[PDB]
Amino acid sequence: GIVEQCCTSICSLYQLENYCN
Amino acid sequence: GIVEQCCTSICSLYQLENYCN
Amino acid sequence: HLYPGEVCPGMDIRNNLTRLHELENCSVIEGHLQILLMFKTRPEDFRDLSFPKLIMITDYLLLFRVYGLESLKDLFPNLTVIRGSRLFFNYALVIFEMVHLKELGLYNLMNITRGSVRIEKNNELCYLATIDWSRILDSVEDNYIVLNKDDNEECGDICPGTNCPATQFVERCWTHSHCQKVCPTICKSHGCTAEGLCCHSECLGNCSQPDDPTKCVACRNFYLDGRCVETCPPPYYHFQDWRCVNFSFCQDLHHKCKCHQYVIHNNKCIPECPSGYTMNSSNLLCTPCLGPCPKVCHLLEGEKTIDSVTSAQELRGCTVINGSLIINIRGGNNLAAELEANLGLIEEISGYLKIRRSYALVSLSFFRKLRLIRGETLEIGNYSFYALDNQNLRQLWDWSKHNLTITQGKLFFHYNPKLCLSEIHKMEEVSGTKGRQERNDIALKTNGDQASCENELLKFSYIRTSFDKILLRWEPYWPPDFRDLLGFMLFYKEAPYQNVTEFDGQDACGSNSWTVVDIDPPLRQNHPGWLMRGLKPWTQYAIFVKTLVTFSDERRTYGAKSDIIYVQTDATNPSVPLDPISVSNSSSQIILKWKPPSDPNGNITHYLVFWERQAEDSELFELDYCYEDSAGECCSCPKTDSQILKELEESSFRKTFEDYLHNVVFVPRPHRPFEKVVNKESLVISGLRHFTGYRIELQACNQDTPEERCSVAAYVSARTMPEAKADDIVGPVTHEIFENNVVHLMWQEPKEPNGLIVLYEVSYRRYGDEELHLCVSRKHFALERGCRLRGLSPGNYSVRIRATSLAGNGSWTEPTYFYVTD
Amino acid sequence: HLYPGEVCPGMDIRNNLTRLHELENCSVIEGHLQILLMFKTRPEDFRDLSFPKLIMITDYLLLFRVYGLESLKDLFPNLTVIRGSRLFFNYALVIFEMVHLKELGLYNLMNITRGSVRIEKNNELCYLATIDWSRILDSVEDNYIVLNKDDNEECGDICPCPATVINGQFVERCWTHSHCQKVCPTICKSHGCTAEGLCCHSECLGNCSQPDDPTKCVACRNFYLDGRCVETCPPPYYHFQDWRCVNFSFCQDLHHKCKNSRRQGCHQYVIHNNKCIPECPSGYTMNSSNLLCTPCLGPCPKVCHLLEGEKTIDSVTSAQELRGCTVINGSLIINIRGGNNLAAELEANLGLIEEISGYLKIRRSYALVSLSFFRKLRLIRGETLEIGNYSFYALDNQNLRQLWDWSKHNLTITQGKLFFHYNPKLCLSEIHKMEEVSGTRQERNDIALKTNGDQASCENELLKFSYIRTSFDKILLRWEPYWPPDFRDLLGFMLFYKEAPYQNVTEFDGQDACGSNSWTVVDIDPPLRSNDPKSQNHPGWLMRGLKPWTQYAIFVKTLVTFSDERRTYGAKSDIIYVQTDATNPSVPLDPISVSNSSSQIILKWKPPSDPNGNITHYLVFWERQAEDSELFELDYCHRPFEKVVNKESLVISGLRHFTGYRIELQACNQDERCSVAAYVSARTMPEAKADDIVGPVTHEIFENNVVHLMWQEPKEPNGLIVLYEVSYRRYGDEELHLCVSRKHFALERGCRLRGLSPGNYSVRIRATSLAGNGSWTEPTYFYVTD
Amino acid sequence: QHLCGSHLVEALYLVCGERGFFY
Amino acid sequence: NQHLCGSHLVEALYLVCGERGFFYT
C-alpha cells in the first residue's frame, strides 16, 4: 500500500525505492 | 464568445484568465 | 405569635410525604426554601393541618410542578412577613408552573418590602383574582400579573359571607376555611386585621393588637424597643428596614442560629457585606479581602440550584464555590447565554461546573481565573465535572493562564462531537483526575467524531479596491494532502458597522444576506482570490475566506479560516438632483427647487448650475388671425445539503478508486450665466423680463478641489408670469375726422411687448346701429399708424381699443368718440 | 469468421509496448487486460500500430498514463463486445489521466455485456456525442463523463452516416470522422447486426458479417462450436463460460496439471452443471478420483479463510469471490461511496454463507436502504472480534433505515456488544427487537439511542381525523388521540399542512432538504392533566386564515416522550386534500373603454385579480351619458346589462356620435354570487359634418336698409352653437363681424341688420358649435341700396 | 447581474492589469 | 510540497523508477 504510506506522511527515497524491485 | 459565459452567465476569476495576454 | 419557636436554617421539601412535617417546629427560616418537581408523591398523599408556628423567612420562595397539593395552609398557615436578602428571579415570590392546586394559604401575608410579585406561567390555578395586590403590596401597575389563566377570572371562588372582612371575584379570600384580611387601599402594604382599617396605623403586614405599635409584627419604620422611629439611634442600626439592633445584638442574632449572618454597615445591621469582604469568625464580621473573594453568598446544605436567568446568587461576587450547582433553566434555545447571565461576574468556579446546549461560542474565555478546586463537599456521584450537548464548542482553555487543579472530583467527557480529543487529554492532565487513579466515566465512541479544532488563519495576498468593485487574492494554501481540497469559500456582506456577526444571514435557503462565492482550487502555482462583480459606491464591506476541503469517513477537518476585513468602496460622479422643478415667482424673477440626488457619493461641496435667456421669434408677432433569516429574499441561496452529500460521495468514490489502483498496481520486493449652490435645494434669479422663457442647466457635485466631478446635466424651460395690464392701449388716440366718412385713427403700441402680438381689436360702434369690429393686423397697423375708416355712417361713433397679444388679455381702453358726418 | 486468431490470457503493460505484437496473432484476450504507466513514449510509437486481431474480451480493460495516443484504433480497430464478467471497481473500463486523446478510433463496439462507464481527465477529446451509447449499452447502470472539456464542444462534433437523434443531438453520427455509428433495430442489438445494419441471427451478439447467419457472425451469443454460433453444446463439449464448448480433454488435463504443483494458485478443473470450472459450488464435494463435482456425503461446511481474517467490500470485484463457502472465516467490513440500490446484486453473493467467524462493520452506507441480502445468518460465532469487544458496527447510515424481518429470520449474538451509533434513519423498533433477540435485553448497551431514528420516521402508530369541516377561510379538524402508557409524556401534536396545486405531496419525516419542501407546522398544546375518563380526549385544531378556493395537504404527527412501551415513537396522520370554499370571484380589475369610431365603442378588461372557482359569464351593466353642452351667458362683443361567457371584451353598437358613457363591470362565478360593479367613464368623438349650417339665407332688401336675415341651425348640433360668425363686409376694408348671440338668433330667427351702408355685401357664416365645427355657408351678395 | 462591456473590461483589467488584457 | 499520493505519487516515483520497467511479479 504505497498510497497508504506516502499520502499519510512524506515518504523518503527508501520507501519509494521499495516498489521498483 | 465571451458573451456566452460572462454577459449571459457567471465568470469566476479562474475562468477569466484565459482571455488575458 | 411573638416568635414562639426555634430558629432553623434553610431547607427544602422534595419527593416525599415524610418531609411535609418539618417546618412545624421552626419559627424563623434562615436560608432558601423551595418545593419543586413532586412526581413521586400523589394527590391524596398530602395532609391538611394548620399551625401558627411560622412568622418569617429570610429568602425567596419557589413553587414548581407540585403534583398533589390541595391547599397552601398545610405548610404555611401563619406566614405574615416575607422578604429576602438573596434574590432569585429578582422576585421574592416565584410560583413557576404549579398545577393540581385550587386554593392558597397566605391570608396573613401583606408585608412586602424587598422584591416584587411575579404571577406568570401558572396553569390550573384558581384564586388569582380574589387577592388585592394593592393590599398585599403596592398597586398592580408595578406587578406583572400576566401570562396566566386568571387574567380572565377562570374558576368560581366562594369567600365566606357571600369571618370575611368588608372588601369569579365576590370578596377577597385565600382558602375556603380562612378569609383574606382586607382594609382600605390607602394602607397599601401596612397590612391589617379584619377591622376594615390598617391594623394599628403604620404597621406592616399584620399586628397582634390594633392601635398599638408595640405589637406590629413589622412596621414601616425601623422598630426599636417598642417604637417605629424613622431612623435608629446609636448604638442601634437598621435591620431589613423593619428593626433597630445594636452591635452586640447584631452579633448575637446570627450567633443564636449557630443560617444567615448580619453585620453592621452603613448603620445597617443587614445580612450583607460590601464588594470583596470575607468573613472572620470571632464575631462573624465583614473583614477586608484581596484578590478573588467570594464574600457573602448562601451555599448551605452542600448544594444550590440555578433555575433562573438572573438572580442575586452568582452576581454578588461569590467566586469561590463551596456548594453544588445544577442548571435547569426553563425556556429559550441556548443555555450558553443562559449560563452566562448568572455567572458573568464570576471567573473562578470552585464548585460543580457543567455546560449544556453549547451554541454561539466555540471557545471558553470566561473561566480564565479558575486555578483550583477544593471539593470539601461531596458532589452528586462524587463527580465535579460533566460535559454534554457541546455541539458548537471548538476549543478548551489555555494552559498558562488557567492552571486548574483538582483535589477532589471526577471527569465525565460525554457527547462532545465538535471538540477534538487533544483538548480532552489536556483536561485529563491539567486537572489531574487520572493522576489520582480516581474512577472516571469516559465515552470516546461518541467523542472525537465529526470534530474539528484546526482553525489556521489565511491572509489576503493582494487587494485592489475600486469604486464599484473590490479585487482580492489570498496566498496559495494546500492542506496536508494536495488532493484534499474542494475550493475556497469567500463569505462577504456589506458592513459599515465595526461589530457584525456571521451566524445571522446564512444557514438557510430562503434568504441570504451574507453572500457566498466559491473559488476553484489553485494551480498545482497560482494565488486563489476573488473579484467583486459590482457594488454600491462609497460603501464599507466585510469580507473573509474559509477553505472547503474533502472530509474523510473519520470526519477530520484540515480546513483553514481567514479573518474578516473591512474594505470600503470608493465614490463616483454624483447623481442628478431628484425632482427638479423651475417655477416663476414674479414677472421679473423665477425660482428653482429640487431634492438631493439619489446617490450622494459622500460629502457634497456645491451644486453646479447654469442659466440663459430664451427669446421669442419675430414670426410669432407677424402672424394674424384676421425559513428566512433576513429581510427580503435571496439571490445567492446555497445548494441543497443532499447535493453536497452526493458530490462528496463521488469525490471520495474516485479517491477510493485511485487508492485501490495504486495498491493493486504496486507490489513490494519479494460665458453663460452661472450660479453655485453650496448644500442647498433652492435657487433664485432676478433681472428677467415679463413673459420670457428661460432654460436652466442643473447638476450636483461632490468634490471640486482636485477635479470637477458632478452629476449629468438637466434642463427645464419656464416663463415668468405675463403682465395682462401691460397690453392696455396707451398713447394719444388722435382722430382725423372728415365730412366724407373718413376718420384716420392713431393709437400707440401697448406699453410692454408681452411677447407675440396677434392683432389690434378696433371696435367702432354707434348707439342704435350694429357694432362693427376691425382686426388690425401687424402690417395694417405698422403701415397705417393706427387705422382709417373707408366708408362710414352719420352720428357720433365711439371706438373702444384693445390690443391683443398672448400674455393674458388686455382691457378695452376708453371709447374714443369721433362724430362722423356725411 | 468467428474466432480466427489465437487465444491470449490477460496481460499487463508497465514496460515497453512492443508486447502488443501479440495482438497480431490472437483475436481475443482472455480475462482482464491492462496498459498503464507508459512514461517513455512520444507520438512516433503510436502512428505505426494497427492490429487485425482482438474480437472478444471477458473482463475490464485498463487505460492509464498513455503518451502519444491520439486515436483508439492504434490498439484494436475490430473489438465488438466485452463480456464484462469481472468489473474493475464496478467499471467495465476506465480511462484515467489521458493527455493525448483527441478523437475515437474504434468503430466496431456494439454492446457491453456488463459494467459501468467512467470518463475523466480528458480535456482535449472529441466525438463523444455521436456514439449512441443507448444502442451500444444493454447493461446501462451509470454513465460517468466528468472532468472533461468536450462537453463544451471543443470540436463541435461535426463529421462527414445515419445521423439519427436518440440523444437529443443533431450532429451527424460517426465513430471517427467517416466511420459511421452503426444503427440497428432495438430487437437486433441482442441478436447482433452487420456493419450495414442488417439484422443478424438470434444466436449472435453485437456485430455480424452476414444477416441472419450464425456461420458468419462476430460474437456467438450462446456458444461457439466448430465455426457456428450454435444454441447449445452437447455435454462431451461442456459449456465454457457460456461463450464456447470445451472437450473433457482440456478439463481433465487442467485438473491433472493443478493436481501436481507446477501451477500456482490453481484449482483442479472439474465439471459442474455440465460446464468445466476450476471448483464446485458450495454444497458439492470434490471428486479427485473422477475429476468431477459430487453431492456432499453428510454435512460439508465450507470454511473459506479470508485474507488475514478480514475482507472489505467496496466494489463488486470484492463480492464475486465469496462463492462456494458456508462460513465466513474472518471479519467483514462494508462501505459504499456513491451509487444507489446496489444491494440487489449482493443477495446471491451473500446468500450462500450461513456463519461468520469475525466481526461485521458498516460505514458510509450509500446504496443500502434495507437489509434483505442475508436471510440465512443465524449464528455469529465471532472468531475475530472488533476492538471494544463488539460483533457488529454501524456508522454514517443515511440511506439505510431498515433491517430484515424478525418473525422469519432470527439471530443470536454469542459474544460482542451491539454498536448502533450515528444512524438516524434506523427505527428504534428494529434496534429493540434485535436487542431482545440477540440479547447481550433492554436499554442501549453502548448504543447512542440519542442519534438513532432522528432523520427518518419510526412511529409505529397512526392518527385519523375523526371530524372535518371546511370553510373558505377556516378548516376545523379533529383526529383520534394517541397515548403512551405514561400520561404526562404527551407533548402535544404537530399539525403539518402545506399548499397543493395537485396531489404531489408526500409525508415529511426528517429527510435531508432545505427550501420550499418545508411544511407549515403548528403546535397543538400538550395535555394539562393525566387524562380524564369522564369525557373524551380527542385532539383537534381549527385552522383559520385559509385562502378562498385553494386545496391544502394536511396531516398531524404526535410528540411523545419515550415510555416503558417500546412502540412509543408517536403517531402519524394521513395527508388529507382539503379544498376551501369559493367567495365572489374577486372585484373586476382594470376596466377599459375606448371608442373605435364615432358609432362603435369597444370595452375590454383584464382578467380579475382572483377568479375563485370558475367563471361562467361576465355580467356587465351599461348605460349612456351626455357630454356637457349648455351655457347661456358669454361675452361675444334596471339599466341595460350584458353578459359574456369567458370573454374579456364586449362590443356595443347602435351608439351615435358625441355621447358619453357609464360602464359597470361585475364578475359572476355562478348563474347570484357576483362581484361589485367597476366604475369607468368614456366618450366618443364628435362629428364635424353634422354641425354645418343648413338651409338658405334671405337677403331681405327694403328701402330702409334693414336686411333682416333668416337662417337655421344645423340638423344635428354637437355641444351648443355659442355664436354665429356672420362675416359680411363693405368692400374697401377688412372683414366686418357681428356678435349674433343666442337670444338674437332665437328672436330674429337669425340676425336683423340695421343701418347698413349702401354697397354690395358678401355674407358667409360658420356655425360656432362648442363641439364639432361647421362650414362657411354660401357667401351670397346683396347690394344695399343707396 | 452579468459582466459584459464596461463590467467585463473593468474585471479583465483588474484580474490582469500588469501584463495587459484583450476584449 | 504535499503528500505523495494520486498522480503526485506516480510522478515522484517515476523520478526513481520507471525507466527499466515497473516492478510486478
PDB file of N, CA and C in Angstrom, chain D residues 341-353 360 362 365 367-378 392 399-406 408-409 426 430:
ATOM      1  N   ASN D 341     -28.905   1.667  -4.633  1.00  0.00           N
ATOM      2  CA  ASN D 341     -29.648   0.428  -4.888  1.00  0.00           C
ATOM      3  C   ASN D 341     -28.767  -0.706  -5.412  1.00  0.00           C
ATOM      4  N   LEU D 342     -27.571  -0.862  -4.851  1.00  0.00           N
ATOM      5  CA  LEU D 342     -26.686  -1.922  -5.309  1.00  0.00           C
ATOM      6  C   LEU D 342     -26.867  -3.228  -4.545  1.00  0.00           C
ATOM      7  N   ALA D 343     -27.642  -3.229  -3.453  1.00  0.00           N
ATOM      8  CA  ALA D 343     -27.862  -4.461  -2.699  1.00  0.00           C
ATOM      9  C   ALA D 343     -28.463  -5.559  -3.565  1.00  0.00           C
ATOM     10  N   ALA D 344     -29.240  -5.181  -4.586  1.00  0.00           N
ATOM     11  CA  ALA D 344     -29.864  -6.149  -5.482  1.00  0.00           C
ATOM     12  C   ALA D 344     -28.877  -7.177  -6.016  1.00  0.00           C
ATOM     13  N   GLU D 345     -27.626  -6.778  -6.226  1.00  0.00           N
ATOM     14  CA  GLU D 345     -26.602  -7.668  -6.752  1.00  0.00           C
ATOM     15  C   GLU D 345     -25.756  -8.320  -5.667  1.00  0.00           C
ATOM     16  N   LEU D 346     -26.127  -8.170  -4.396  1.00  0.00           N
ATOM     17  CA  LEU D 346     -25.363  -8.765  -3.310  1.00  0.00           C
ATOM     18  C   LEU D 346     -26.078  -9.900  -2.594  1.00  0.00           C
ATOM     19  N   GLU D 347     -27.383 -10.078  -2.812  1.00  0.00           N
ATOM     20  CA  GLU D 347     -28.099 -11.152  -2.130  1.00  0.00           C
ATOM     21  C   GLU D 347     -27.534 -12.520  -2.498  1.00  0.00           C
ATOM     22  N   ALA D 348     -27.364 -12.783  -3.797  1.00  0.00           N
ATOM     23  CA  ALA D 348     -26.815 -14.072  -4.212  1.00  0.00           C
ATOM     24  C   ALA D 348     -25.375 -14.229  -3.742  1.00  0.00           C
ATOM     25  N   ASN D 349     -24.572 -13.172  -3.885  1.00  0.00           N
ATOM     26  CA  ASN D 349     -23.183 -13.203  -3.446  1.00  0.00           C
ATOM     27  C   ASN D 349     -23.066 -13.387  -1.942  1.00  0.00           C
ATOM     28  N   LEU D 350     -24.138 -13.117  -1.198  1.00  0.00           N
ATOM     29  CA  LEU D 350     -24.130 -13.219   0.253  1.00  0.00           C
ATOM     30  C   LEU D 350     -25.185 -14.171   0.799  1.00  0.00           C
ATOM     31  N   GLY D 351     -25.890 -14.910  -0.054  1.00  0.00           N
ATOM     32  CA  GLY D 351     -26.891 -15.833   0.437  1.00  0.00           C
ATOM     33  C   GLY D 351     -26.399 -17.255   0.569  1.00  0.00           C
ATOM     34  N   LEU D 352     -25.132 -17.514   0.241  1.00  0.00           N
ATOM     35  CA  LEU D 352     -24.548 -18.839   0.394  1.00  0.00           C
ATOM     36  C   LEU D 352     -24.067 -19.040   1.823  1.00  0.00           C
ATOM     37  N   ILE D 353     -23.432 -18.005   2.372  1.00  0.00           N
ATOM     38  CA  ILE D 353     -22.883 -18.035   3.718  1.00  0.00           C
ATOM     39  C   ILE D 353     -23.988 -18.124   4.759  1.00  0.00           C
ATOM     40  N   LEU D 360     -18.407  -7.690  11.893  1.00  0.00           N
ATOM     41  CA  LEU D 360     -19.100  -7.163  10.723  1.00  0.00           C
ATOM     42  C   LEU D 360     -19.306  -5.685  11.002  1.00  0.00           C
ATOM     43  N   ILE D 362     -20.005  -1.624   9.312  1.00  0.00           N
ATOM     44  CA  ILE D 362     -20.608  -0.880   8.209  1.00  0.00           C
ATOM     45  C   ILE D 362     -20.353   0.613   8.364  1.00  0.00           C
ATOM     46  N   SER D 365     -22.949   4.061   4.561  1.00  0.00           N
ATOM     47  CA  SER D 365     -23.876   3.341   3.701  1.00  0.00           C
ATOM     48  C   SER D 365     -24.460   4.304   2.675  1.00  0.00           C
ATOM     49  N   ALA D 367     -25.886   2.804  -0.590  1.00  0.00           N
ATOM     50  CA  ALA D 367     -26.627   2.066  -1.606  1.00  0.00           C
ATOM     51  C   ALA D 367     -27.598   1.079  -0.978  1.00  0.00           C
ATOM     52  N   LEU D 368     -27.619   1.020   0.348  1.00  0.00           N
ATOM     53  CA  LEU D 368     -28.474   0.094   1.076  1.00  0.00           C
ATOM     54  C   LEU D 368     -29.565   0.864   1.800  1.00  0.00           C
ATOM     55  N   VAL D 369     -30.821   0.581   1.457  1.00  0.00           N
ATOM     56  CA  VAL D 369     -31.952   1.214   2.123  1.00  0.00           C
ATOM     57  C   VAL D 369     -32.591   0.250   3.114  1.00  0.00           C
ATOM     58  N   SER D 370     -32.447  -1.053   2.896  1.00  0.00           N
ATOM     59  CA  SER D 370     -32.961  -2.100   3.762  1.00  0.00           C
ATOM     60  C   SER D 370     -32.044  -3.301   3.607  1.00  0.00           C
ATOM     61  N   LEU D 371     -31.968  -4.122   4.646  1.00  0.00           N
ATOM     62  CA  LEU D 371     -31.145  -5.325   4.612  1.00  0.00           C
ATOM     63  C   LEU D 371     -32.045  -6.498   4.256  1.00  0.00           C
ATOM     64  N   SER D 372     -31.850  -7.043   3.057  1.00  0.00           N
ATOM     65  CA  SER D 372     -32.610  -8.189   2.583  1.00  0.00           C
ATOM     66  C   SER D 372     -31.668  -9.217   1.970  1.00  0.00           C
ATOM     67  N   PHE D 373     -30.399  -8.833   1.799  1.00  0.00           N
ATOM     68  CA  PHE D 373     -29.420  -9.727   1.186  1.00  0.00           C
ATOM     69  C   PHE D 373     -29.129 -10.981   2.017  1.00  0.00           C
ATOM     70  N   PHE D 374     -29.036 -10.906   3.346  1.00  0.00           N
ATOM     71  CA  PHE D 374     -28.891 -12.173   4.057  1.00  0.00           C
ATOM     72  C   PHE D 374     -30.234 -12.614   4.617  1.00  0.00           C
ATOM     73  N   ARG D 375     -30.490 -13.913   4.519  1.00  0.00           N
ATOM     74  CA  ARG D 375     -31.697 -14.492   5.086  1.00  0.00           C
ATOM     75  C   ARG D 375     -31.330 -15.811   5.758  1.00  0.00           C
ATOM     76  N   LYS D 376     -30.039 -16.149   5.794  1.00  0.00           N
ATOM     77  CA  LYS D 376     -29.550 -17.388   6.373  1.00  0.00           C
ATOM     78  C   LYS D 376     -28.710 -17.194   7.623  1.00  0.00           C
ATOM     79  N   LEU D 377     -28.246 -15.976   7.897  1.00  0.00           N
ATOM     80  CA  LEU D 377     -27.420 -15.760   9.076  1.00  0.00           C
ATOM     81  C   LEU D 377     -28.234 -16.022  10.331  1.00  0.00           C
ATOM     82  N   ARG D 378     -27.776 -16.980  11.130  1.00  0.00           N
ATOM     83  CA  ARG D 378     -28.466 -17.318  12.364  1.00  0.00           C
ATOM     84  C   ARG D 378     -27.467 -17.433  13.506  1.00  0.00           C
ATOM     85  N   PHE D 392     -20.678  -6.308  15.872  1.00  0.00           N
ATOM     86  CA  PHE D 392     -21.409  -5.580  14.846  1.00  0.00           C
ATOM     87  C   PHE D 392     -21.122  -4.096  15.009  1.00  0.00           C
ATOM     88  N   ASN D 399     -28.731   6.218   3.960  1.00  0.00           N
ATOM     89  CA  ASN D 399     -29.693   5.539   3.108  1.00  0.00           C
ATOM     90  C   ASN D 399     -30.336   4.342   3.793  1.00  0.00           C
ATOM     91  N   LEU D 400     -29.640   3.701   4.730  1.00  0.00           N
ATOM     92  CA  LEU D 400     -30.196   2.537   5.404  1.00  0.00           C
ATOM     93  C   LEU D 400     -31.115   2.942   6.543  1.00  0.00           C
ATOM     94  N   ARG D 401     -32.338   2.417   6.504  1.00  0.00           N
ATOM     95  CA  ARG D 401     -33.337   2.700   7.524  1.00  0.00           C
ATOM     96  C   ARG D 401     -34.115   1.456   7.931  1.00  0.00           C
ATOM     97  N   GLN D 402     -33.737   0.291   7.406  1.00  0.00           N
ATOM     98  CA  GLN D 402     -34.459  -0.939   7.701  1.00  0.00           C
ATOM     99  C   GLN D 402     -33.509  -2.121   7.824  1.00  0.00           C
ATOM    100  N   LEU D 403     -34.037  -3.187   8.425  1.00  0.00           N
ATOM    101  CA  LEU D 403     -33.335  -4.444   8.650  1.00  0.00           C
ATOM    102  C   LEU D 403     -34.187  -5.574   8.086  1.00  0.00           C
ATOM    103  N   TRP D 404     -33.797  -6.823   8.326  1.00  0.00           N
ATOM    104  CA  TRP D 404     -34.571  -7.954   7.838  1.00  0.00           C
ATOM    105  C   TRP D 404     -35.807  -8.139   8.710  1.00  0.00           C
ATOM    106  N   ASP D 405     -36.623  -9.129   8.372  1.00  0.00           N
ATOM    107  CA  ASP D 405     -37.794  -9.376   9.192  1.00  0.00           C
ATOM    108  C   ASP D 405     -37.337 -10.211  10.375  1.00  0.00           C
ATOM    109  N   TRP D 406     -38.112 -10.184  11.453  1.00  0.00           N
ATOM    110  CA  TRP D 406     -37.705 -10.910  12.641  1.00  0.00           C
ATOM    111  C   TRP D 406     -38.815 -11.841  13.129  1.00  0.00           C
ATOM    112  N   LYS D 408     -39.345 -14.470  10.734  1.00  0.00           N
ATOM    113  CA  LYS D 408     -38.887 -15.494   9.804  1.00  0.00           C
ATOM    114  C   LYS D 408     -37.375 -15.652   9.813  1.00  0.00           C
ATOM    115  N   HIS D 409     -36.641 -14.605  10.181  1.00  0.00           N
ATOM    116  CA  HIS D 409     -35.187 -14.566  10.245  1.00  0.00           C
ATOM    117  C   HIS D 409     -34.794 -14.164  11.657  1.00  0.00           C
ATOM    118  N   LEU D 426     -32.411   4.600  11.099  1.00  0.00           N
ATOM    119  CA  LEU D 426     -32.786   3.293  11.626  1.00  0.00           C
ATOM    120  C   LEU D 426     -33.796   3.421  12.759  1.00  0.00           C
ATOM    121  N   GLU D 430     -36.539  -1.882  15.248  1.00  0.00           N
ATOM    122  CA  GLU D 430     -35.625  -2.972  14.930  1.00  0.00           C
ATOM    123  C   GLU D 430     -34.523  -3.074  15.975  1.00  0.00           C
TER     124      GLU D 430
END
